[PDB]
């Protein structure tokens, strides 16, 4: 119906979920003998990690030894990837300056892919950060169950767009369109209880 | 840090998955010490077979020192 | 001519679930039995042979 | 979540006390309907893709939203929409079981009304789905239990608003 | 509750409720007239089986009450008391709502770091709540025995 | 994992027809089964930590293994064995509830000798621990469950030797 | 985050300069505080659990935050303040350390205020709890560390209320 | 060792050691001295006061070795003693590594697991623990009197 | 507010230049449209009451809205829903004798959608009211004449939703 | 707002249907309970200060409120106090003759939850001030005009809690 | 303060401070000290002088400490004396701020609405604090006198 005129075409071109669902690159190391995908995995890995390349936040890079057994094929891509957790680049630029519910909404950005679920989640993960530090914090989210049923143990995280639960998509996509440093404050803070228990 | 290294056959029992898969079906990998009774708790929730375990980082039995 | 004069203390606070006041006099009517004073000293035990062993 | 027992659970527990005769009222209350909810809810479980295929034939195709360049058209965005509405079905089965409506302002109201605004999705064109679903919902199980349906159905579409 | 449960359960499978779960909230919707007699039976007698089980416990274990326990004095044997009515009538609403949910959201999740704060020995809770499940036994019927000691079992196995 | 119902529709359709007569009758003893079954496990529950605790006490305290040049000496690695024997006792109960050691085939023993001997942990002692545990549970849930709660203990004992 | 000696750093290197003598005079007074801080964060790490078990017994304990209704009631909530409250103690060691509140306002309040309002968390309540904590640091520590103490625990009462 | 600490620390951001932690090191190899002087003094005094602190928490926590706790007993209060000789043995591996790596790697982590299956009084052992601070320090010098009661209080701190 | 010709002056004015030679041909361009937009906008001003007229009549009436309890109810409403939609005629003409988009934004859509939330008004009744608006105009001027008619309503459309 | 009456009215309207007899028993209630209405309105307008007098002097006087530090200290915070209960006493009467909490829903509790949260307020002694008010003016108008008043006060109460 | 009063009034009149008023806070400034010793000999002097002032209410007014009075109770006079001491706090605070904004932002501002909640006489308070005056006269040096005496008179006007 009507002319459907030009302003309104470009509204309706770009209209429900972004196209950048299908407009990426799923990092799947496939064998470890081609050592260019080799390192274009890893580089993919800092990428996704770290939300940029690691350029110029290195004296040199410090993960070479985690790139080394990467290559020689005893360790994983997840097992790479909670090395890149498990290390002082990472607390630098996303657990020194954020409060812990930021670390954990980071964590889940880079890690999971995805906002956190649920207080419950946020509860679990601040207990962990709690008493552990971040290390037991990068190792049991990579560790979980959710990491090896998305991702398993070949591939690089990446940006997830998910259905389930609510307010999960909307904080991912506000976790996500905001870039690198762009404000302090929380998407997701904590969930707001419908019912307050005693 | 006294890490272990494994080798595992993971089968996949849900999907039948169409790219290359055993690179994450048959691995060998590092495993750490304080991850490594989580992930073999993991596998074998999702079904894999532990072939083969042994500590091929640190000495068995040490008190102190295991850092 | 009476005078109603009242007091320096406020109404008392209705006693509520959480408060274990209500519950002091079911302690009291426990009392419950305390434990004697040990007279053991420590010194004269000898960490060798006292700790067992199975 | 919250069902009605344990709403009625909570509300003696932040006032401390016991659960006296008007609480063991109100769950004998929960009982009686309990019949109904369990029918009802086996009901649409059974049937629960011929009231969207419904809902949707009644108050979505044919219309600008499904001609092309709308948000109805191209059939991923349809495939969402028909999980969207099995959804708000499911959740509104889900709360009619319960007997509270805290599932749907906790599990589908929580954030829905910026997820649809920045997915460019009409408010009220999702508002009608929702009443149609309710007027096949009390159509399809009667009028008590379609009523219960239709109050957290409308729950949801207030929600929505 | 057993319909929050069977909610949670069919929301994370992401279906429709099963009729196994549907005709279990079915059961459980004609019963709980045995239920809620058992809840009321311990509303009448919730002083009494606080009263015996701290009796019990303080004479297995008089350490909590000797001089350097946790309760020691009248006013913290009051405390003990409080904690013991909790745990009770968190029992009750187990009883009532047919699943052990609203014991774990109110009074079972944390109770280590709690209790690791007060310095309670969290196994004399366990005694404690153990003691209040034999004397609701004895003074409850046998089959409403079993009923309230599926949730008074919860709660002990949780504790200790 | 299976249980006994899956293994006797597994070894059913292994050679590929329908229940006969003697899978019925198999049915019927785990159906029977089931009450003490569940009984045993609420009681397990019950007593999860005391039961570790009593047969750590009667088996592998104030012994060498718990003494200094021993395996369990040190805090880490008597919470291992804690763990462990917890872990034990749980999975133990989990196949007392299935009928069937395919749990502890898929889920306790595979990958567990073998780290066992990786570790230097003593295979001997962790096996009168398993003991220890069936004599405890044994006492404290009564014989006639205790007889299959000892069957599974002992499975895990011959599985670890 | 910064202490006070790359704060003095900071401030010299954005004007492009060396050491000037108030850098000299600033670094004289944060080495001559020094010895005091230093020793406070010993006491406080060896008694660390001791001045929120007696602060939460102070301020907390036997009240109605406590009591049913409250938000203290229910021990999952209970465990979260005793870990809310390790955490403002924590981060004020840290800060007494430092000599700068850089890591108070850029790890603490940053969001603490609205996450609370979201959690319905009694601002006023944790504000005593905090006041309590200062009391009992002032009863362990001394007098110069407990009132720099103070200044950075009312500085995070500033920051929340 | 803090050698161990800078070594897991310059090996973990995948660096050669910084010059601080190299005269942090230098600083520990010249105290050395002090330190092994502290250990074998200590390894000396160590009955008198494992007893003196074993009584003085006896007459802090009489509920201890009462009738109904975890001590009670000679055989029950013996190990008790064992486990304070275990945990001074402990201080001094700290003292004379320099850190307080090997004291939690033998002693502190999964303690509280350790402990709750015994059902012990983990506030109770801090206290012992604080006696043997108080005995420690009346019995040993001054002047090293704060650097072996910071390992002492690092105990205090992990275990209470 | 702003036209195609002042949307011209703030474009040069922006980068602080002159008026270059494409900007007396956008000049020129909207001298040769402004013919046809004064001959629509007279049109328009004198049927300006049938156009709403007809199509409430065609999209407004006999619906759930105008049913009792509905928002087109109560005279009052029904007579402010027909002055909204006068109000949108008589600033989509503004907007088609401008050129440009921002009376829109700056006048009618600015808390539109606002008003419209807390007021309970149906948003794609509202939307399809519109349509119906533009496709009577595009009628009544004509098709190249109704284009930019259309355009501003569709604006209208794209803002509100 | 609307009294009991106009709410009828108003229900009807939204449902489409003339006054049934569910309509004509309620105003039939109403109509019987409108002398006790205007009998209880006037002994409350004779008796409005006293009412607060003694309910401000049975509740929060000689308390922590009253004492410097309480929010209740200083004549403006006390004078504010007192209007605050003669609004709740004359709403309440509104409210008690209309038979409906319209007006306390509209005119009272529109924003006083964050009022007095951004004010410090205590909002348990302002519901028990409220019960204080409800005692006096239950001994005072009757035991059933009092129980009205009573349930209006603690939909007061509920609605600031 | 005379300078917040001042620097609202000149914001509200959207201008900077006149040099008038610029030059008064300086002489509040220069002749601060005398207050500082009004204040501090108040703060040295307030039990005695309420006694006095109290005393003399009760001989010149019989009907405050009548029966059926307000202030008849022993109850009563010791919170009248409550109000005669915030009064007292109030002159202190106003002669420290050199301005009447701390009386009437703490203890003016609503108060017949309390009063007349209470059922007091807002002219018997005036009396009251009347009596401070004159016995604050009697009792402190003559020259600052003028400047208590002052701001008692500003009280002991705006309210009766
Ligand atoms: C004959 C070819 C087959 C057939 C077709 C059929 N389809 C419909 C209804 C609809 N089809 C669509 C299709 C699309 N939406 C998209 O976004 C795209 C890709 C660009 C497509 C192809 C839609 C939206 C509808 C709904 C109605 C509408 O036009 O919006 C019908 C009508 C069903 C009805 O009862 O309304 C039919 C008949 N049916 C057959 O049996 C043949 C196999
Ligand atoms: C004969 C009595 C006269 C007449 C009437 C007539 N009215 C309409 C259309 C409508 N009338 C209303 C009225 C109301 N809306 C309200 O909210 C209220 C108050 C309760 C009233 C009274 C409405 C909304 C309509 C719109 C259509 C609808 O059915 O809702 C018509 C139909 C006109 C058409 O072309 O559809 C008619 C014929 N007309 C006459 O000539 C007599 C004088
Ligand atoms: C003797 C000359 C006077 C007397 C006094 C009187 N006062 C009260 C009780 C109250 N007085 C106050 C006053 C204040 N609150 C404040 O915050 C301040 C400073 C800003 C003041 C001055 C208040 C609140 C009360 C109520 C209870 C309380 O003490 O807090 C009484 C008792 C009245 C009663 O019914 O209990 C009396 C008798 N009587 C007089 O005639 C002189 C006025
Ligand atoms: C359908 C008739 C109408 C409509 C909607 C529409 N929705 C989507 C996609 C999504 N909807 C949601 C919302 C929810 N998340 C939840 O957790 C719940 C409750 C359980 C709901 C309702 C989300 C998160 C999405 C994005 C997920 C996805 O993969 O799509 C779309 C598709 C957008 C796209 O680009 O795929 C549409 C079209 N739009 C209409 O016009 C109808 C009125
Ligand atoms: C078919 C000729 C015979 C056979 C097949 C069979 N295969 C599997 C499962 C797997 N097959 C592979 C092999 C590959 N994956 C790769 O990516 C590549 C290179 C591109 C190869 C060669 C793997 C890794 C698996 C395991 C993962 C999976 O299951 O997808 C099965 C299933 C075994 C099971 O039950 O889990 C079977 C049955 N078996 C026959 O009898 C045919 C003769
Ligand atoms: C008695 C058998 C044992 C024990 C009791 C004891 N408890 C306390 C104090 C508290 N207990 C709680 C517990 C709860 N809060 C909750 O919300 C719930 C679930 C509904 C529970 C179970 C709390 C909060 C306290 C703190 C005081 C308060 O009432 O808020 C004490 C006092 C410790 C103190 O230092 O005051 C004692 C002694 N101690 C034993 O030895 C027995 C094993
Ligand atoms: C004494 C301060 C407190 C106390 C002690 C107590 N301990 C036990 C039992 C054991 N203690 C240990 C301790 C360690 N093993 C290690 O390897 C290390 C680190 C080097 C330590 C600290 C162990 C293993 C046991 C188990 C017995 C055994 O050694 O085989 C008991 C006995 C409890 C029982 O037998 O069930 C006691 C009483 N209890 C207190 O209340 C004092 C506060
Ligand atoms: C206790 C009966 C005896 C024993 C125990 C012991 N275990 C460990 C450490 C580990 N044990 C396991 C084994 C398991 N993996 C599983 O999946 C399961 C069942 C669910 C079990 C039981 C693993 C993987 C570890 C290493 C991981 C971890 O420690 O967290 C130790 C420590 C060895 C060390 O050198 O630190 C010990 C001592 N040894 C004995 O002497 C007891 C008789
Ligand atoms: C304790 C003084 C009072 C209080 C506490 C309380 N806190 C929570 C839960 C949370 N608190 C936080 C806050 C932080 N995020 C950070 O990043 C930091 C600093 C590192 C802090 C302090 C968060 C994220 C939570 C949620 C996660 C969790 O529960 O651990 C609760 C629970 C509320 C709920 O039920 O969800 C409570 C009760 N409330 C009081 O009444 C005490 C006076
Ligand atoms: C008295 C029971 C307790 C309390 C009262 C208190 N209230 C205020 C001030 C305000 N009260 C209101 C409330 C309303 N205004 C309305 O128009 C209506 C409905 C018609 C209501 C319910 C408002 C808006 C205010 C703020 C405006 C004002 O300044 O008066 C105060 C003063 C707070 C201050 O900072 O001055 C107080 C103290 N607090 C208590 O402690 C008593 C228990």
């Known amino acids: 119906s009507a002319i459907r005129t030009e302003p309104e075409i470009a ?12 407009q990426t690159k799923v990092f799947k190391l496939v064998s470890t003998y081609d050592k260019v995908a080799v390192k274009n995995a890893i580089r993919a890995a800092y990428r996704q990690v770290f939300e940029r390349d690691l350029e110029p936040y290195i004296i040199n890079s410090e993960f070479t030894a985690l790139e080394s057994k990467l290559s020689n094929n005893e360790i994983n891509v997840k097992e790479f990837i909670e090395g890149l957790g498990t290390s002082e ?13 930021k670390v954990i909404e980071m964590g889940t950005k880079h890690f999971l892919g995805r906002a956190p679920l649920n207080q419950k989640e946020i509860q679990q993960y601040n207990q962990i950060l709690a008493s552990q530090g971040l290390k037991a914090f990068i190792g049991a989210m990579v560790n979980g169950m959710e990491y090896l049923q998305t991702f398993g143990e070949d591939t690089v995280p990446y940006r997830r767009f998910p259905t389930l639960p609510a307010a999960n998509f909307p904080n991912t996509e506000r976790l996500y369109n905001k870039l690198t440093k762009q404000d302090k404050e929380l998407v997701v803070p904590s969930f707001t209880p419908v019912v307050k228990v005693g | 840090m006294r890490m272990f290294r494994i080798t595992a056959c993971v089968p996949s029992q849900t999907r039948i998955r169409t790219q290359r898969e055993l690179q994450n079906t048959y691995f060998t990998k590092l495993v750490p010490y304080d991850n490594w009774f989580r992930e073999q708790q993991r596998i074998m929730k999702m079904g894999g077979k532990i072939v083969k375990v042994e500590l091929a980082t640190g000495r068995p039995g040490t008190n102190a020192g295991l850092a | 001519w009476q005078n109603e004069v009242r007091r320096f203390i406020p ?8 408060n274990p006041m209500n519950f002091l006099g079911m302690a009291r009517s426990i009392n419950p039995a305390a434990n004697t004073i040990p007279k053991v000293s420590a010194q004269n035990i000898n960490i060798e042979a006292s700790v067992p062993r199975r | 979540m919250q069902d009605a027992i344990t709403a009625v659970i909570n509300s003696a527990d932040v006032q401390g006390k016991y659960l006296d005769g008007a609480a063991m009222d109100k769950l004998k209350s929960y009982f009686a309907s309990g019949e109904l909810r369990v029918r009802a809810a086996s009901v649409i479980s059974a049937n629960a893709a011929t009231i969207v295929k419904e809902a949707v034939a009644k108050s979505l195709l044919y219309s600008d939203v499904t001609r092309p360049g709308g948000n109805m058209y191209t059939t991923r965005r349809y495939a969402a929409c028909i999980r969207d509405l099995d959804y708000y079905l499911r959740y509104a089965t889900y709360a009619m079981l319960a007997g ?16 649809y605004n920045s997915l460019g999705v009409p408010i009220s064109s999702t508002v ?13 199980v009667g009028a008590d239990a379609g009523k219960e349906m239709g109050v957290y159905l409308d729950y949801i579409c207030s929600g929505l608003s | 509750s057993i319909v929050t449960k069977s909610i949670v359960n069919a929301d994370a499978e992401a279906r429709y409720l099963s009729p196994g779960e549907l005709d279990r909230i079915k059961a459980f919707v ?3 007239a045995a239920r809620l007699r058992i809840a009321e039976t311990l509303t009448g007698s919730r002083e009494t089986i606080v009263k015996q089980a ?14 350097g326990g946790n309760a020691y004095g009248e006013e913290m044997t009051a405390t003990c008391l409080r904690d013991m009515d909790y745990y009770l009538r968190l029992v009750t609403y187990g009883v009532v709502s047919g699943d052990v949910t609203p014991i774990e959201e109110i009074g079972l999740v944390g109770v280590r770091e709690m209790y690791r704060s007060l310095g309670t020995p969290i196994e004399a809770v366990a005694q404690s709540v153990r003691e209040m499940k034999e004397v609701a036994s004895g003074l409850m019927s046998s089959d409403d025995a079993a009923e309230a000691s599926a949730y008074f079992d919860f709660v002990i196995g949780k504790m200790s």
């Open chain 1, 11 to 22: 509204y309706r071109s770009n209209q429900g979920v972004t196209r950048q669902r299908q």
């Open chain 1, 89 to 101: 680049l990472y607390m630098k630029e996303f657990y020194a300056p954020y409060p812990n519910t």
């Open chain 3, 11 to 18: 109404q008392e606070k209705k006693l509520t679930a959480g």
């Open chain 4, 100 to 115: 509270d409506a805290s599932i749907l302002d906790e599990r589908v109201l929580n954030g829905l009304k910026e997820t």
């Open chain 4, 128 to 140: 009608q789905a929702i009443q149609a679903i309710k007027e096949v919902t009390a159509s399809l």
């Open chain 5, 30 to 32: 004609t019963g709980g």
């Open chain 5, 54 to 67: 701290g009796d019990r416990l303080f004479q297995k274990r008089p350490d909590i009450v000797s001089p």
